Design a protein around this ligand. Structure first.
Ligand code: HEM
Ligand SMILES: [Cu+2]
Length: 81
């Protein structure tokens, strides 16, 4: 496992680097921003933070969750969970 602090994840909130936390897992979605069927805006608003509630609320297919696995870079540090 690779752990990332909330302090570190929060720096990745822009077009050069966008990270997202979903259910304690950290994803680098920089290359996915323009490819997202739900638009760049919803991802840009949540960039550098936890979006678990937002992701589950709209509903996402198993296909969306399998695609999500390809962007995983680590997990949120246990002290920030
Ligand atoms: C901030 C987090 C996210 C929000 C709020 C969000 C929101 C949405 C919305 C509104 C749609 C439109 C379909 C609908 O009306 O239900 C959608 C579709 C989709 N999203 Fe996201 N999404 C998020 C993150 C992601 C991520 C991280 C991925 C994958 C890497 C992803 C992949 C998709 C795909 C593939 C679809 C097409 C419909 C489906 O397969 O379920 N989304 N998203
Ligand atoms: Cu989960």
């Amino acid at each position: 496992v690779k752990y990332y602090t909330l302090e570190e994840i929060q720096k990745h909130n822009n077009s050069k680097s966008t990270w997202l936390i979903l259910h304690y897992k950290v994803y680098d979605l920089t290359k996915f921003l323009e490819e997202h069927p739900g638009g760049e805006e919803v991802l840009r608003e949540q960039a550098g933070g936890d979006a678990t509630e937002n992701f589950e609320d709209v509903g996402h297919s198993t296909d969306a969750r399998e695609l999500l696995k390809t962007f995983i870079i680590g997990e949120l540090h246990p002290d920030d969970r």
